[PDB]
């Protein structure tokens, strides 16, 4: 059984705040005595290109309002780091979880807490694509919604702050240092993202899941080695496969080598059959997710 | 755009507890000074039929252990109600949210917080299907994982407690009164759920979402009224359509009538061959009208 799930959101909900500057309102993340939010909150209302350095230079602290559940935090100072602001406030969040900041790589799964006016409304799992966008669900006001993972030891990894929706509908965010994933511009524009590749690592994980449920009509008897597959992958819109040793767990139970699944990917690249609900190959689930969702390991 | 989401889980996480009886461990929900959990926790280890009335009469309170995040709670009394136990503990949960209990009906969406040994590990949205089962992701230890909805005023509706997995993989739970959805037995058996029907109300919502995303290659100009569609649905694995006026927000915007979508379902009932609608290769009944409206417009 494979279902996209999110990790529980309680520890992150207690960090979401409402950040307002003049009339513009979005979400921020309150950790210790710092609130991080997208710098879009200080943009002027215009249709011309936004000059954020000038906006930052004309900033007044008294124009900020930062609140958590209707209680207002005193703003002490603000600095700009790439596409985000770090707002120092005069009160520390007593519910700050143990945490680190982590920069995602394409193929990484994480969780989104979708927020509006500082209040969480939904939580869902997503995967960072090779073009550094995600397929979320966001409407107006979701800017600043955080992305996170929770480690085994309880440590929250803060990895994403929602920034913008592209004309394609794909979603763009930054990490907490202010670097925009994919280096997209954090303001309205005509930018078009490059085409996504199929995440071969995730396809392999998904095929192991089907094997563990007796679904094996698609299993190729022959093998391709990694160097052969990676040549085919370049010419057919797939990423290179990372390693074979990681799948040794799943290679045990099945007991199927990665090279047999690489061969199956070439053949399946269903007429009109089906794999675990899907009619084409799925790159939504990582190796870790499959292992955690099937064995709790 | 359409993404299956869960509502935030924080207020429910603070109610999840670990319930142990002898060697058996599962999850419970702690509200006020009461813990509700599946009565499976007091079942003897055996392979023959469980007589829960006998298990209850021989139950002793000192065999229970109940904890929240490792802090153990004292057990004061226990009563049995259908397939759940109500365990009175000697302190109240100071983080009990405002809440009610509500029994789901087929077609209702809700949220599952999947828990193991009293600790939440995942959260996801689900629909109660017409055969009174859900398609979750549970492994060993998920018994007692709660289902919930959060009303607009912040009230939590507690509606589901995970009970058992059928041999087909289908998942079965009870409400907090102990009534098992679909009246399945709450112990290992050979029972099989009835055939799933496509939730027609959800398919209509999904087709409105497609139209709002500019996907209309499939749209029929023919019209089928509600009575005719419900007769067709009987013969073709679909539920009746409940009403048409609830969709008027989307009908005005698109601007396509529900009766045109009913005709479209009949036209698309077998595959799309081999086109897609919002990425799907067959009709999707995963999303409710409320979800489409809330995800598209925030309403």
């Amino acid at each position: 059984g494979l279902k996209k799930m999110a990790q529980p959101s309680g520890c992150v909900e207690r960090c979401v705040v409402r950040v307002c500057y003049g009339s513009t309102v979005l979400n921020g993340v309150w950790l210790g005595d710092t609130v991080t939010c997208p710098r879009h909150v200080i943009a002027p209302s215009t249709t011309v290109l936004i000059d954020y350095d000038h906006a930052y230079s004309t900033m007044r602290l008294h124009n900020f309002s930062v609140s958590h559940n209707g209680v207002f935090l005193g703003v002490v100072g603000v600095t700009m780091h790439g596409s985000v602001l770090r707002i120092k406030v005069s009160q520390s969040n007593v519910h700050t979880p143990k945490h680190v900041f982590k920069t995602l790589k394409p193929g990484d799964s994480f969780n989104i807490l979708a927020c509006y006016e500082g209040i969480a409304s939904g939580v869902f799992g997503v995967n960072l694509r090779t073009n550094f966008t995600i397929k979320g669900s966001f409407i107006n006001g979701a800017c600043g919604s955080p992305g996170y993972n929770v480690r085994n030891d309880g440590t929250v990894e803060f990895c994403y702050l929602h920034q913008i929706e592209l004309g394609s509908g794909a979603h763009v965010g930054s990490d907490f240092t202010g670097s925009v994933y994919g280096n997209f511009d954090d303001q309205p524009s005509l930018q078009v993202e490059s085409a996504n590749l199929m995440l071969s690592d995730n396809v392999v994980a998904f095929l192991y899941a089907a094997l563990l449920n007796g679904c094996r009509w698609w299993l190729c008897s022959t093998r391709v080695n990694v160097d052969g597959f990676n040549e085919w992958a370049m010419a057919n819109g797939y990423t290179s496969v990372s390693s074979v040793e990681c799948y040794s767990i799943l290679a045990a139970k099945t007991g199927v080598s990665v090279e047999q699944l690489l061969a199956s990917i070439q053949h399946l690249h269903f007429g009109g059959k089906n794999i675990l609900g899907y009619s084409s190959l799925c790159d939504e689930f990582t190796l870790a997710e499959v292992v955690k969702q099937m064995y709790g390991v």
Side-chain angles (χ1 to χ4, degrees), chain A residues 108-154:
Chain A
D108 283 356
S109 67
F110 61 110
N111 311 279
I112 293 289
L113 185 63
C115 302
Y116 299 93
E117 306 257 328
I119 303 302
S121 80
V123 63
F124 52 92
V126 288
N127 191 277
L128 182 64
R129 276 125 38 104
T130 59
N131 66 8
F132 280 98
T133 68
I134 64 168
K135 303 275 218 112
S137 194
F138 298 112
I139 42 169
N140 190 57
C143 193
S145 289
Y148 65 97
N149 277 306
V150 186
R151 301 209 298 229
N152 296 286
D153 56 22

Side-chain angles (χ1 to χ4, degrees), chain A residues 1 13 23 74 79 108 125 170 201 217-218 257 260 268:
Chain A
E13 295 169 45
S23 288
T79 61
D108 283 356
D201 288 358
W217 63 274
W218 48 267
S257 73
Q260 247 188 296
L268 295 164

Side-chain angles (χ1 to χ4, degrees), chain A residues 1-2 208-210 212-213 276 289-297:
Chain A
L2 259 198
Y208 272 129
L212 296 165
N213 298 145
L276 287 188
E289 272 170 306
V290 166
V291 169
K292 169 59 174 307
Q293 225 172 98
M294 302 248 167
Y295 303 119
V297 160

